[PDB]
Amino acid sequence: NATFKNKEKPQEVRKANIIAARSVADAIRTSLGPKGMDKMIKTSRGEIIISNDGHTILKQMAILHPVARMLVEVSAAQDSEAGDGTTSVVILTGALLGAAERLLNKGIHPTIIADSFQSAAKRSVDILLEMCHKVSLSDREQLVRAASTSLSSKIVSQYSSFLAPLAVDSVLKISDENSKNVDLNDIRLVKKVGGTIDDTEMIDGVVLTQTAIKSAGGPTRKEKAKIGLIQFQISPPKPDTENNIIVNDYRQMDKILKEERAYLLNICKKIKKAKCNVLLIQKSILRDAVNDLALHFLSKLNIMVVKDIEREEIEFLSKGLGCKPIADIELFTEDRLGSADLVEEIDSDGSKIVRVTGIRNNNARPTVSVVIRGANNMIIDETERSLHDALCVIRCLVKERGLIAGGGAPEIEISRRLSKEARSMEGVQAFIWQEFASALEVIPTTLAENAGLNSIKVVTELRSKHENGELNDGISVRRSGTTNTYEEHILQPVLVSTSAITLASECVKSILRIDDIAFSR
Template sequence: MCGSLLNVCKSLLDKNIHCQKISESFFEASVKSEEILRNMSIPIDLNDKNILIQNAITSLNSKVVSHNSSLLAPIAVDVILKITDINKDRNVDLNNIRIVKKLGGTIEDTEIVDGLIFTSNKISKRAHGIKNLSEAKIGLIQFCLSLPKTDMDNTVVVKDYNSMDKLLREERLIIGKMIKKIASTGCNLLLIQKSILRDAVNDLALDFLAKAKIMVIKDIEREDIEFISKTCNCVPIASLDYFTPDKLGYAESVVTESIGYGEIVKITGVESKNTISVLLRASNNLMLDEAERSLHDALCVVRSLIKEKAILPGGAAPEMELSQKLYQWANTLKGSKQICVKAFSDALELIPYTLAENAGLSPLHIVTELRNKHAEGHKYYGINIRTGTISNMIDENVIQPLLVTSTAIKLATETVMMILKIDDTVICR
């Protein structure tokens, strides 16, 4: 859309219309477009899950995983509704949703977990270690359970076996005291943040933790700390001195399951109701990555409906209706402003043209037919790519959020206005 607007700007500049006049006219056209879209939109009730699911399906139909849209769309809707109060909230924080990818199985095996999920590469495996817990007390630490490193200029020289034995005893003593302090708080599940300087936890510490019946999940990424803290209602602890019972979180159940090509740990029965996890499954990495992107798009669509409780028909119907209405409105204007607004309306026809072209249809024939339908007052008619004809998009359940179209036009217009303000460019290396 932005490129189409820039193309018509070039023709307007060739007619010696000043760029400031073009910017002002485009801004007015953008404001008028939002008014037209609101009049065209259909209010929805967020308690009607079918409307939300249908919008999510529309966004998934153009994806590689479109054949799984009937599965992923309800998941996207359920996830949003679980962390949102639709009667109060006007936005959804997608940072409260954690998508965990697991290779193996199919997309049909994807599930929602009301808690946390950790994959096999983060699970500490010891012969006498525990794998399942009930009534877990969770500690989240950001310090290392290993010996401190010396400075770069210092060295430790061991000259005989007695010194070596003393060094090893001292290591066991230091690590043992650390584990004893952790165990004294009642902690039985320890989450350890990944360290870039040294091992966050060494083998000796893992053995001591296993003997103390403390389950360990290591290599927690820094960006996941806030989500884990919010989910388990625990406080990240940066020093052993501050490891106290009041900073521990709680979960009813911790279960290790073998799925796909490894194991996962599910932590459920947590206190927080504002976060949720999705275990995404697929048979190969390509499908797994594509499913993640598609699910994220579906989540964004549902979030748009939470922000703006209204829908529009799909199939390029809004853009064609805007083009028609703006052209009629332009006839009420005078001078160069009329020319600029008409150029703006012409640029919007690129959307139905491109949609028809991508669907393998004849763009000229389809766009002309669609233009005639809208001229007759059929504002909900759009391009049905399944049948290759023009039909009522509302009847076909091809719908999209109002916020998506209005934001696209607004941002495209603002970008063009910004580019028009550029007087000259300097080439640099």
């Protein structure tokens, strides 16, 4: 026929951005699942690295094109909510862009396409809630089995027996019956060399990263102590202008010494008048933090001193302890402190790690520190990420109750239910909402491809069992075929799949909404 000629073609910019963004998901789609294939990446510096992690590949890919850069923020938002499945969220976005590519070939404007995925995604979430099997936090048997089987993909398979309830109990202590977003950054994982995996403790108040006093008279332990965060530094007076001190005499040396010791003592006396048993000094390599002469003064006062506190802890220590930061000794008071039940230095095979319990504060809130012990560096490392992943599994169940059977089963069942619901619509609502269901089939397809199974065969077998049976039937790599994934203990929480289509619909929207790219300085 004869229609709008479109002499200037801005569509070529949008079509090129979709193809370029789909090329990202083409490489990422093979890293999905435990059978996924690794990707080789050579950094500009010449370092050769390899891994299957989707969030790590997108970080080390050095992505330039802006539309492909957006998939990094999608994988980051996928990790910020669910914490797992950063590979699957990019795969789902690639298919929606691939489906929208066929939608643009039919003469459909991308604004209608963007709004079409909105009503399709918001309804797909409601369909997923219909098949979801609701659980409860009162049952700790399902919570441990969910965390234990999720850690079977991790370096320690057998030790997850004691690791699973630890991550469950750590969240349940700080989470009541009704809570939406439970912050996992409030749970601090402190790893220390030495000990074993069987030795692990969940400390209520907080745990520090450093020792206390290596000099003479170090208390190393205190009962009923008050703690505060010192951002100041105890040093003799150092004027920023040009200064010179010339000592040719023994009396001139003692004169400067006694004046400095008197200034350091006055700072130590004001701390003792504030009833401060334990002090935390911010780490400063610029100038001296606390002079050794001041350490001897605070040692006689029986005041525990802990220096070299990283700035990353300063923000967290003001949370769990419920105290206030101290900019200067003049603003340093008892009212800004905490009340600690016990402050001690735990030494396990030359460790000397310091832990604090009994915050006993009204400002206290869901903050818990966990001590991680181990011999090799690969132990305390993987164990930290093992719990961090297990903490996210519990957080998904607290925010949205219930879990779904994984293995590509929900992506097929939603695709089949929504396709039948699209037949009851009229006009545009019929055509595009069919393509959204076909884009959901990419997840079980890549699972069958990465596992060596036949693509067409396995999908038709699962589409066969979902008409009679239900979500329980899915892909299982352990059985090398199609079986019940609920009896195989493969369990994906509902928030992962809920935050998947949601962030995928927002990504495809933000892409199609970009009609051009112009250089602007």
